RNA sequence: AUAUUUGUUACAAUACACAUUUUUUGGCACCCAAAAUAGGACGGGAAGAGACUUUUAAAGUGAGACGUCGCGACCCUCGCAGGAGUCGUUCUUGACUUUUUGGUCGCUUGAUGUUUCUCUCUUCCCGUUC
């Protein structure tokens, strides 16, 4: 019976992919922290749409879904 | 805990925490350390900008930021670069913001 | 950001001294040192004018190939050339190297 | 044409005939009467003007004469979500 | 002020008719009302003017004037208009 | 605000609606809320491409409304004093 | 803040357009302040009435954001 | 903190308000509402030309631009000049403020 | 009356599988077992697969945002 | 007196002509009996304010010319004006009607001034002019008017328009 | 015998509150392609022809679908009153009730915008530019 917010609290500092709603782009990286709005911070992220990205901030409105 | 229960100062401590410890701490640490950031808007045009200021809504003040936008018609591509000395950016357009090494 | 008295070490020269000989780089420093006073705000306008340029983390000066820097120091001199010039009221053509040095060194 | 007061807010102007721009590229011209926090406003005698697709092609860069199809709708109430920008056309009776 | 017309071409359209009337009455004075509110047609139109003098002039000059085939019968209104 | 209060003052009168989808619903207004979502009675509908139909009752979301046409005689209504 | 008033609509078979393209018909069950509308025996209407129409599920819930207009085909 | 309170102190400055349509507005700035509703005075508002073998510009922004009544007939390119435009807040994308003003004084 | 989020809670505890349509722009529909939800109608789906619009790839336990939700259908 | 900017400014632009558009301007103290002997100079003072209608009736104007680019203007009432010729290139795309009653316009002078157009105006009144009397004046006016919706209150007859077009060919 | 000023109260009104499906921190963006020279282009109107359609050689200019206000009428139709009535009240105001000309048909191509598919030359007349 897990809800979304404890699900993000359980996914902290685990490898998580996040699919944005636009190009079917997903950022694969270790989650750092989340906001009330579910803003995302990531370390060692990689952009799949192939690249490697050091640190990332993702705004809440553009994400489609979050997976592990 | 919902926001309507808290008092006037508890919201100030909450925003201080969210900026100091939270996702937007990526931007805050970028403002103090003078590290240039990369910002992708919804438009699809990416700015390399140094952040003077930022805010809750993510709208932020950047100086010396450089804008990079490409366009294609029938798979004919051209890359265009535009330099503006001062920028105020409304935060609803942005999607991903990364902190350069 | 320092609330306490302390000794701190930094390099004024940075890239330019590392690229160009030591006599000339002090001279390029002094062309700069006069200039930033005359550049009240256009300094960050002229030093950042090429946005491709970035400041190295250890270093202070914008690291660059040094050609715009020769253009930067020349534009900056002209700002010094006019500001020294306007107070005494001299024509720009009347300005000579012996006057231009007297502007630089005095 | 008409010079609006150098500092005049939407509250300062009432009964002026305005020109309202929406997100869809159509315009509502008429007297403003009220407005609101989120800027949905009430026009008295309003005519919506539209640009023809052939007219839109003409507007592309090269005296132009556009045929602007417009229809009259009196005493409407707009929605702040649709409004884009507002301009002044005339001054009150 | 108002001048009640009669005996005109009903076959012509309303707006057009009004326009025509306006065109006619602009020479005498400033026409306040373009067309009669009732819009029954077939002659019945109330040409509202700003000045009474102008109205009088109109009455004088355009009595039995050729407008769309038939001669218009000009006359002064019984009651005053709502606008005036 | 006055703009919504005028919509509440238009209850029981024929009004016109433009949805942001492009359609046009003209008919008699039964209910309206402060969220601007209204329900209309015995209303003629014009699809975005012009096809016109008729439906007895309709409820529309206020967020999708673009402009509302209200009987003109409400212009001098006391809200505007 | 205020609950939308569908109170006369519930239990009546209702057609409602989802987005620009879509039209769903079903018997209205419940609703909330965001207009989220749950209905049963849902059917997705299409050009060919018996043919392209296909049922969805025993219970379907709709986000109020995608609701445009709601018409009841019923008393 | 609301950073919009910064724009309130930029009053009486030359600015470009670059909107979501791509439409750009050069003008003198007046009071900015807390919702970032920006009211200008003497404004020349236009649309950039993507060159790219003359690719078609925004079709809605051309109509919205001709419908301001400020586009003059003999303008070769696509521009309009007018006095007093009032802009809703959610339409703004970027704001390019002048190079002269110092941020350290205004950002406090 | 059956409030809609009550019905969703009846999708959580009854363990019935659901197909869920997204916005018309994205072009995929998700299906899985709805576990729990928030006030914003953003839901966690266990054993979810994304079908383009039956060769779709399996996702996982995935949090899906409520902004893109259109239908939740059994 | 002469039509200046000050006069224009003074003019009553309050009462809008409710038949079509807005701002029915009447230049000077009153355009009706203003007595503008010269051509309509200082048109730029109006600056295309607003089927914008301008009433110039009972004034001395000799020539229908000297206009600034007016996009709005749709109606010109010029009654009791000593108009002789009205040739211009400013008011071409703009304008939907022209009332020229009781003026001095020539049958050939009126025809010459326009120079013909593929499309123009839509409503025209030439009544109480010398030209209208002239033989085949209606046929000549229809040929000159080129496209036309009216001719002195009576529409050029569809068949008359066809015959006039044949005469033009 | 010598309206202005000061203080208080209320109303209107501007500057300090809210990123989570109902308005202001965005479901965002994309169809693609067309002028270069040293008498010449460009727009509009008219005519001819090709190719298209229709009938069994002869007829006009890419085709098929919503509306929009218009040109005709073998029809209807009387002809002068947003306003009207009532009551309170005093020389024109409030409160309470009754409810728009066009009702239609052709168009022997009104005139004109959406939306899908596929692939122009010659001659004259009028404006602009070098």
Curated annotation (Swiss-Prot), chain C:
Transmembrane segments: none annotated. It is found in: Nucleus. Present with 468 molecules/cell in log phase SD medium. The MPN (JAB/Mov34) domain has structural similarity with deubiquitinating enzymes, but lacks the residues that would bind the catalytic metal ion. Contains a region with structural similarity to reverse transcriptase, presenting the classical thumb, fingers and palm architecture, but lacks enzyme activity, since the essential metal-binding residues are not conserved. Component of the U4/U6-U5 tri-snRNP complex composed of the U4, U6 and U5 snRNAs and at least PRP3, PRP4, PRP6, PRP8, PRP18, PRP31, PRP38, SNU13, SNU23, SNU66, SNU114, SPP381, SMB1, SMD1, SMD2, SMD3, SMX2, SMX3, LSM2, LSM3, LSM4, LSM5, LSM6, LSM7, LSM8, BRR2 and DIB1. This is Pre-mRNA-splicing factor 8. It comes from Saccharomyces cerevisiae (strain ATCC 204508 / S288c) (Baker's yeast).
From Swiss-Prot, chain D:
It is found in: Nucleus; Cytoplasm. It comes from the Eukaryota. One of its GO terms (cellular component) is nucleus. GO terms for molecular function: RNA binding; snRNP binding. One of its GO terms (biological process) is U2-type prespliceosome assembly. Its main location: nucleus. Keywords: Cytoplasm, mRNA processing, mRNA splicing, Nucleus, Ribonucleoprotein, RNA-binding. Residues 5-92 form the Sm domain. Present with 861 molecules/cell in log phase SD medium. Belongs to the snRNP SmB/SmN family. Component of the Sm core complex, present in spliceosomal snRNP U1, U2, U4/U6 and U5. The core complex contains SMB1, SMD1, SMD2, SMD3, SME1, SMX3 and SMX2 (Sm proteins B, D1, D2, D3, E, F and G, respectively), and is probably a heptameric ring structure. SMB1 specifically interacts with SMD3. Plays a role in pre-mRNA splicing as a core component of the spliceosomal U1, U2, U4 and U5 small nuclear ribonucleoproteins (snRNPs), the building blocks of the spliceosome. C-terminal extension may function as a nuclear localization signal (NLS). This is Small nuclear ribonucleoprotein-associated protein B. The chain holds residues 3 to 102 of 196 of the full protein.
UniProtKB/Swiss-Prot annotation, chain E:
One of its GO terms (cellular component) is Prp19 complex. The keyword DNA-binding does not apply. Keywords: mRNA processing, mRNA splicing, Nucleus, Ribonucleoprotein, RNA-binding. One of its GO terms (molecular function) is U2 snRNA binding. Its main location: nucleus. Belongs to the CWC complex (or CEF1-associated complex), a spliceosome sub-complex reminiscent of a late-stage spliceosome composed of the U2, U5 and U6 snRNAs and at least BUD13, BUD31, BRR2, CDC40, CEF1, CLF1, CUS1, CWC2, CWC15, CWC21, CWC22, CWC23, CWC24, CWC25, CWC27, ECM2, HSH155, IST3, ISY1, LEA1, MSL1, NTC20, PRP8, PRP9, PRP11, PRP19, PRP21, PRP22, PRP45, PRP46, SLU7, SMB1, SMD1, SMD2, SMD3, SMX2, SMX3, SNT309, SNU114, SPP2, SYF1, SYF2, RSE1 and YJU2. Interacts with RDS3. Interacts with LEA1. Present with 504 molecules/cell in log phase SD medium. This is U2 small nuclear ribonucleoprotein B''. The chain holds residues 28 to 111 of 111 of the full protein.
Curated annotation (Swiss-Prot), chain I:
Residues 5-74 form the Sm domain. Pfam families: LSM (PF01423). CDD domains: Sm_E. One of its GO terms (molecular function) is splicing factor binding. It comes from the Eukaryota. It is found in: Cytoplasm; Nucleus. One of its GO terms (biological process) is U2-type prespliceosome assembly. Its main location: cytoplasm. GO terms for cellular component: commitment complex; cytoplasm; nucleus; pICln-Sm protein complex; precatalytic spliceosome; spliceosomal complex; U1 snRNP; U2 snRNP. InterPro entries: LSM_dom_sf, Sm, Sm_dom_euk/arc, snRNP-E. Keywords: Cytoplasm, mRNA processing, mRNA splicing, Nucleus, Ribonucleoprotein, RNA-binding, Spliceosome. Involved in pre-mRNA splicing. Binds and is required for the stability of snRNA U1, U2, U4 and U5 which contain a highly conserved structural motif called the Sm binding site. Involved in cap modification. Present with 556 molecules/cell in log phase SD medium. Belongs to the snRNP Sm proteins family. Component of the Sm core complex, present in spliceosomal snRNP U1, U2, U4/U6 and U5. The core complex contains SMB1, SMD1, SMD2, SMD3, SME1, SMX3 and SMX2 (Sm proteins B, D1, D2, D3, E, F and G, respectively), and is probably a heptameric ring structure. SME1 specifically interacts with SMX2 and SMX3. Component of the U4/U6-U5 tri-snRNP complex composed of the U4, U6 and U5 snRNAs and at least PRP3, PRP4, PRP6, PRP8, PRP18, PRP31, PRP38, SNU13, SNU23, SNU66, SNU114, SPP381, SMB1, SMD1, SMD2, SMD3, SMX2, SMX3, LSM2, LSM3, LSM4, LSM5, LSM6, LSM7, LSM8, BRR2 and DIB1.
């Amino acid at each position: 019976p897990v809800n979304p917010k404890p699900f993000l609290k359980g996914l902290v500092n685990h490898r998580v992919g996040v699919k944005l709603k636009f190009n079917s782009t997903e950022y694969r990286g270790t989650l750092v922290s989340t906001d009330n709005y579910f803003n995302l911070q990531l370390n060692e992220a990689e952009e799949f749409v192939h690249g490697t990205l050091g640190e990332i901030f993702i705004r809440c409105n553009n994400v489609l879904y979050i997976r592990e | 805990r919902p926001k309507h229960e808290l008092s006037r100062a508890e919201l100030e401590e909450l925003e201080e925490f969210e900026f100091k410890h939270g996702p937007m701490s990526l931007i805050n640490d970028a403002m103090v350390t003078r590290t240039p950031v990369i910002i992708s808007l919804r438009n699809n045009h990416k700015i390399i900008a140094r952040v003077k200021a930022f805010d809750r809504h993510c709208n932020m003040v950047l100086e010396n930021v450089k804008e990079l936008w490409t366009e294609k018609k029938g798979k004919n591509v051209i890359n265009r670069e535009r330099f503006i000395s001062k920028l105020f950016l409304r935060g609803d357009s942005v999607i991903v913001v990364l902190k350069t090494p | 950001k320092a609330t306490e008295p302390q000794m701190v070490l930094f390099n004024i020269y940075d890239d330019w001294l590392d690229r160009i000989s030591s006599y000339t780089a002090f001279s390029r420093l002094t062309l700069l040192l006069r200039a930033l006073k005359t550049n009240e705000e256009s300094a960050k306008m002229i030093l950042l004018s090429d946005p491709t340029i970035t400041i190295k983390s250890y270093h202070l000066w914008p690291s660059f190939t040094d050609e715009q820097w020769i253009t930067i120091e020349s534009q900056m001199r002209d700002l010094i050339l006019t500001e020294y010039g306007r107070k005494y009221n001299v024509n720009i053509s009347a300005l000579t190297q012996t006057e231009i040095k007297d502007i630089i060194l005095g | 044409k008409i010079q609006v007061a150098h500092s005049s807010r939407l509250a300062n102007l009432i009964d002026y005939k305005l020109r309202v721009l929406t997100q869809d590229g159509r315009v509502y011209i008429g007297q403003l009467m009220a407005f609101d926090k989120h800027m949905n406003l009430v026009l008295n005698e309003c005519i919506e003007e539209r640009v023809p697709k052939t007219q839109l092609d003409k507007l592309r860069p090269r005296t132009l004469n556009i045929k602007v199809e417009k229809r009259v709708l009196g005493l409407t109430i707009l929605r702040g979500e649709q409004i884009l920008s507002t301009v002044v056309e005339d001054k009150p009776l | 002020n108002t001048l009640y017309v009669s005996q005109l071409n009903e076959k012509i359209n309303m707006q057009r008719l009004r326009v025509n009337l306006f065109l006619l009455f602009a020479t005498f004075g400033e026409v306040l009302k373009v067309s009669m509110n009732f819009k029954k047609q077939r002659g019945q139109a109330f040409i509202t003017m700003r000045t009474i003098d102008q109205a009088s002039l109109a009455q004088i000059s355009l009595n039995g004037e050729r407008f769309f085939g038939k001669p218009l019968k000009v006359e002064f209104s019984k009651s005053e208009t709502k606008t005036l | 605000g006055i703009p919504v209060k005028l919509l509440n003052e238009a209850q029981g009168h024929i009004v016109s609606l433009e949805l942001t989808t492009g359609a046009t619903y003209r008919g008699k207004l039964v209910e309206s809320e402060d969220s601007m979502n209204v329900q209309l009675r015995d209303v003629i509908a014009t699809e975005p491409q012009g096809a016109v139909t008729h439906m007895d009752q309709i409820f529309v979301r206020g967020s999708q409304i673009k402009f509302i046409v209200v009987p003109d005689l409400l212009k001098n209504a006391p809200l505007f004093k | 803040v205020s609950t939308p008033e569908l109170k006369k609509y519930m239990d009546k078979k209702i057609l409602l357009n989802i987005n620009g393209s879509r039209k769903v018909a079903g018997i209205l069950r419940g609703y909330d302040i965001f207009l989220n509308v749950v209905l049963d025996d849902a059917m997705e209407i299409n050009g060919e009435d018996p043919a392209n129409n296909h049922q969805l599920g025993l219970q379907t819930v709709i986000r109020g954001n995608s609701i445009i207009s709601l018409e009841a085909l019923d008393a | 903190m609301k950073l919009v309170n910064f724009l309130k102190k930029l009053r009486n400055e030359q600015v470009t308000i670059e909107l979501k349509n791509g439409t750009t507005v050069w003008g003198t700035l007046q009071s900015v509402s807390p919702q970032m509703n920006a009211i200008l005075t003497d404004v020349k508002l236009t649309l950039p030309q993507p060159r790219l073998n003359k690719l078609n510009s925004n079709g809605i922004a051309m109509a919205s631009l001709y419908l301001t009544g400020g586009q003059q007939p003999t303008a070769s390119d696509n521009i309009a000049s007018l006095q007093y435009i009032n802009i809703r807040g959610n339409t703004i994308r970027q704001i390019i403020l002048p190079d002269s003003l110092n941020l350290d004084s205004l950002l406090v | 009356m059956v409030p809609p989020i009550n019905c969703i809670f009846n999708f959580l505890q009854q363990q019935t599988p659901v197909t869920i349509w997204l916005f018309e722009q994205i072009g995929i529909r998700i299906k899985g077992k709805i576990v729990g939800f928030d006030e914003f109608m953003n839901v966690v789906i266990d054993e979810a697969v994304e079908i383009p619009v039956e060769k779709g790839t399996p996702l996982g336990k995935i949090l899906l945002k409520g902004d893109n939700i259109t239908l939740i259908t059994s | 007196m002469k039509f200046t900017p000050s006069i224009v400014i003074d003019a009553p632009q309050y009462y809008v002509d409710h038949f079509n558009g807005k701002y029915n301007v009447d230049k000077c103290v009153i355009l009706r009996d203003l007595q503008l002997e010269t051509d309509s100079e200082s048109m730029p003072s109006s600056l295309k304010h607003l089927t914008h209608i301008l009433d110039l009736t009972n004034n001395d104007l000799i020539m229908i010319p000297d206009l600034s680019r007016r996009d709005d203007i749709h109606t010109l009432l010029l009654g009791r004006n000593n108009i002789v010729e009205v040739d211009g290139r400013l008011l071409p795309m703009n304008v939907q009607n022209l009332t020229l009653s009781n003026n001095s316009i020539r049958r050939f002078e009126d025809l010459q001034r326009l120079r013909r157009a593929p499309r123009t105006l839509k409503n025209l009144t030439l009544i109480g002019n010398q030209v209208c009397h002239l033989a085949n004046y209606r046929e000549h006016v229809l040929r000159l008017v080129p496209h036309l919706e009216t001719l002195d209150f009576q529409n050029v007859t569809a068949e008359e328009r066809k015959s006039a077009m044949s005469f033009p060919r």
